[PDB]
Amino acid sequence: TNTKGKRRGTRYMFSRPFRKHGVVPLATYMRIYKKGDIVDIKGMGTVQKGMPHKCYHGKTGRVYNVTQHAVGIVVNKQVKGKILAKRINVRIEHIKHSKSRDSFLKRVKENDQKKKEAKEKGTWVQLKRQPAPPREAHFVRTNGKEPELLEPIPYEFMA
Amino acid sequence: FYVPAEPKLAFVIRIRGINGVSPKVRKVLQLLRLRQIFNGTFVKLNKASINMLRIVEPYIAWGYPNLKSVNELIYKRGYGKINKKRIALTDNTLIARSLGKYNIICMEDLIHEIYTVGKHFKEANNFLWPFKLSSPRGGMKKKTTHFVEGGDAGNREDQINRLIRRMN
Amino acid sequence: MKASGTLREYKVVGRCLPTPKCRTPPLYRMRIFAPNHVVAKSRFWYFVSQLKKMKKSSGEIVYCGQVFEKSPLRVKNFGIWLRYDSRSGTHNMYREYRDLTTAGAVTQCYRDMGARHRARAHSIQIMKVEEIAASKCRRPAVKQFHDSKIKFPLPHRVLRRQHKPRFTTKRPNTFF
RNA sequence: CCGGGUGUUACAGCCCCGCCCCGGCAGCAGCAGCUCGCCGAAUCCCGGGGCCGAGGGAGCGAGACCUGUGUCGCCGCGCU
RNA sequence: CACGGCGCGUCGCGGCGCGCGCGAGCGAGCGCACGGGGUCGGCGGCGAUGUCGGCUACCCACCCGACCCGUCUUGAAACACGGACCAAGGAGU
RNA sequence: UAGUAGCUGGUUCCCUCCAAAGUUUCCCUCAGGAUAGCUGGCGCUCUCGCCCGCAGUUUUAUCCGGUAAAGCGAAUGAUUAGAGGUCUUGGGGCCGAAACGAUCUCAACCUAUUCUCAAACUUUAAAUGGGUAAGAAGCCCGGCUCGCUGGUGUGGAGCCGGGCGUGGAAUGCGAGUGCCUAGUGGGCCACUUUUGGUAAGCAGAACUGGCGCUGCGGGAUGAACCGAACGCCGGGUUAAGGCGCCCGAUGCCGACGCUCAUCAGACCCCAGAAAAGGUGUUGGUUGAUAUAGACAGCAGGAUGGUGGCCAUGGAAGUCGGAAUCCGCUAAGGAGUGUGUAACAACUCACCUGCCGAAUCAACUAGCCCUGAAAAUGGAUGGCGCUGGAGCGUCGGGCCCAUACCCGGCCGUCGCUGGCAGUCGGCAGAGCGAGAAAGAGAGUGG
RNA sequence: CCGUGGAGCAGAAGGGCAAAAGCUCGCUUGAUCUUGAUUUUCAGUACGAAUACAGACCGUGAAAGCGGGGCCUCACGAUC
RNA sequence: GUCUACGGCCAUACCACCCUGAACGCGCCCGAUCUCGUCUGAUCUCGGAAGCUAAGCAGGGUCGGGCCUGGUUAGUACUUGGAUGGGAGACCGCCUGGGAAUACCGGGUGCUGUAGGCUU
């Protein structure tokens, strides 16, 4: 059977990208994580302290505790037929703010603003994101040039 | 050239049985409310509906229904879902109560709203119980393969009307 | 394709959707022989995807209509340039037929391909169909019908409707 | 009569091409009941064959000045 | 033409729309029916020692179907095991 | 002493409803247990007749990866071949006392190239896929507490109070929660992916669906294939598959072709065949030559230097080694073959006479044939079939499943549906009707 | 002088590392005392291993800081 | 236009060679009493201001290497789902969707934050 080591099969997952080894850029250290941010997990092999287990690599969780160097986050893990929301502590290098939430936040601010506006105007405005509707009817103008014929080319071997 | 607008309404008929269905296809068929062979329903078209139908192409025959097809389907096979019960629509008051708040008050409102995909098409279609169509008189071409390659599955633009004429 | 019944000829023109790169993509036109317009559009998308970097999701059928025969009362000779797949390798050929309609000639071509080379419609790729003058015809099976005083009998007429008089006291005659 | 050759309207015809009101006239997806289509808010009428008939007190009008009846509700009509 | 009274008519844009009163939101009868699931206010024969009815059940014929049960087993008609037949007794207290 | 048995065998009435597992971890554990998982029963808390949630699904955003592919003129590791440079060294020689002084070279070396590779290589890098978000538990304000952090009522957190409902993607659907609990813990098969193995109806995995637990139509037969899942019936129509007879349906004046087998062929799984060949036949590709008269076929020529040089005992063209010339010519090869030891002789290439319009190849692909040998007599299911009842492409019509549609009947579940209003000379017969609520009781003008 | 690691970091291999995690010196004993939480196998139980903290005593450095064993992935043991 | 101090993103910023640098600045540079450290005041530390853009550094150049970004390769390779498709097989074709990577050919060669100067 296999081995139950903590880092089995991570030679590519925890490795560094090509031509990106060396000193960790300081912007990663200079970011602020508060209680309740949605955050992504991406193990970085450069630092070995507080490295998350390989099964949380690429997972997104919620911050619930902030500490000197690390952050505690609640993340869902599918174990057999059930999902457990378990909390793990990850050092700040292996973490990154999720941009999936800021889009929704900006949308909230923007449609709240356009709801506050036009409230006095009384006009109607659409807020829900409708799915891509079918294309409407239109005209395709030929400019006096007729469409050119397309025919299959004859078979002839290359190799 | 004048390209007509892409159709907004489609009719879908399940043409495969219950035995041996992939879980994803089973879930999409449940969502589309095709739990029985030769069941049919109306679907409004968008990106989500296109992809959902593409997932279950081998199990359904779908097309763009005609006005006469909508009329006949509503009048002959049309039953309403009132109080979680399948009630045949034999009077306008049954429609008027279930869809009065949406200004649908009779068969004509129901048919118009379905055919033109109105603002409350979702409510109208959900009130409409899935259609139980008889087996296609005259037979099918080939159930297993796609319509383009001479079968019956997949998308047939307007031949769904020919299919409906014999399946109802 | 399933070569069901007699084929029909369709003129199909299509184009890419307008994009910020280019406002008006060029329109591409093709002749498709197909049982109906649905399979005609499918074949158009297939061929244009092979030729150009076009897909149905990133394109649109600007127009699709059946083209009727110009002279359906004049018997004509048709030359067809064709590309097909064998069990081992693919081949280009040229075959001539004799018929009143281009669609009829192409249907004859499909049936002849199936009969002589066991090639199927999904293997045949039809390339060119042209009216060919009797002087330019070069297959003897078509050339032998090019004469003013054509004359031949019907030598051995086989009795059909063999079952309507299922028990008949004659032995049937085959010389008429 | 046939065969071979020449050739360009002749004692047959064929194809294309500017116009003559797209020349004019029917007609028209034609019961010249098969030359090739897709259909019906742009669709109605009549007829034939087969199987079945489950359910069983729906009410009407009469007005506390009457007490009848069992063809009644919705719908479409007709007559006064 | 699912049009139909008189008015005060601005309830009004120029009349149509569209409001306020008119014992004040009460006209009645008959009749036909593509109308909340069939009725006939339609008929015809054969009936006393040779005839009527009797699904099933007794015997027989025909067409179609049809391998012997129980058990262990992935798999039993098995060239796997128990079983000639019948009566009584016989095992989650 | 009815000793123990994780092991065999057996384990007694009906109907109704629900309905599995052969998988995880531990065990002197591997024919067994415990524990999760899968099941049933009992409930309970709410819900609708504005809104909550949920989803084996999609959409819009946003991250995650190192497989398929590809690459070696990129790293690592393999790997073929020639080019150009030098003394940076070695090896055969050479002139040199010697001299990087010099001549070739063979090499190793360097620089550009070049052929082919990787499960334990990789700059790149999919498709399918794995998370997260898509609002009321949200946004926007005002104010308090803090022993934490603090240049700073700084930061952060917790508290109160107040204002905002277009309930902020599609589709579908009532949801949550708690006890007790049986059986199971031998599995097998199939498309796709995949490891060992020459391979196997072998052994081992991943995903999904099946069989087991399951009947029905078709595949003649059949645990798994194709269709379709089932209460008892009538009518209609189909799926897959079929329609010469067995055997329901083509007893159509069905369409176009191909094929002759002295071993024909005849329908997923599937039950039998390859390389190589055919001047059998049918298509197709490419290249030639033919009225300056071909292809046949019938006839005439097919010469000198020279019996060319090296050769062998003998080679005159015909065993051997290079070349292959000229004048004569309508043409003749220092020769295509047969022949002798050598000749000789015959014959061919090539050109002429007659004949007078099409003729040669080389490939390629269909059907058929050779390749093709096993034992009881023998199996497209059989009979049989060749203007097919075979093969390929196709058209109408027709046949039938327990599937689908309509109807009847039985039962189960749901509506936690309705009925105490049988309110009668003491009475007045309703609460089906699109619109939350009185056929309300009475007092004045 | 060139030298992106082609060396070294105890060991297998893989990942990681250049004014360092390598080499050489200086000083030391965070390999110390203590309660909880979490991850890894998982039944989501132990052991083992590991991760963030918190409370004392310290080490080092000018200091920010770093350190409660070894750069990470393995080197170990219930009841009585 | 540009520099210095501290930086963010970390080659469009690197590497090789060549040309030009006004002012400030950054440097090279001059010494070892003190602080400090070496075999050596070379480095480090300290005290200065005679000279110089030689070098670093900055800007620019190269049919430059590299790097970054496009086209081609290419709807090719591969691939989700489907068939009672073909083939003895190996494998291949089609339907429904997604869709690469070399060679080869183009374009570009650091943006920018805070504080403080020079261009009087």
Ligand SMILES: [Mg+2]
């Ligand atoms: Mg199936």
Ligand SMILES: [Mg+2]
């Ligand atoms: Mg029929």
Ligand SMILES: [Mg+2]
């Ligand atoms: Mg299938």
Ligand SMILES: [Mg+2]
């Ligand atoms: Mg029988």
Ligand SMILES: [Mg+2]
């Ligand atoms: Mg047994």
Ligand SMILES: [Mg+2]
């Ligand atoms: Mg079993």
Ligand SMILES: [Mg+2]
């Ligand atoms: Mg025995």
Ligand SMILES: [Mg+2]
């Ligand atoms: Mg036994």
Ligand SMILES: [Mg+2]
């Ligand atoms: Mg016995």
Ligand SMILES: [Mg+2]
């Ligand atoms: Mg007994």
Ligand SMILES: [Mg+2]
């Ligand atoms: Mg006992």
Ligand SMILES: [Mg+2]
């Ligand atoms: Mg045992």
Ligand SMILES: [Mg+2]
């Ligand atoms: Mg046993």
Ligand SMILES: [Mg+2]
């Ligand atoms: Mg891997």
Ligand SMILES: [Mg+2]
């Ligand atoms: Mg590969």
Ligand SMILES: [Mg+2]
């Ligand atoms: Mg196996």
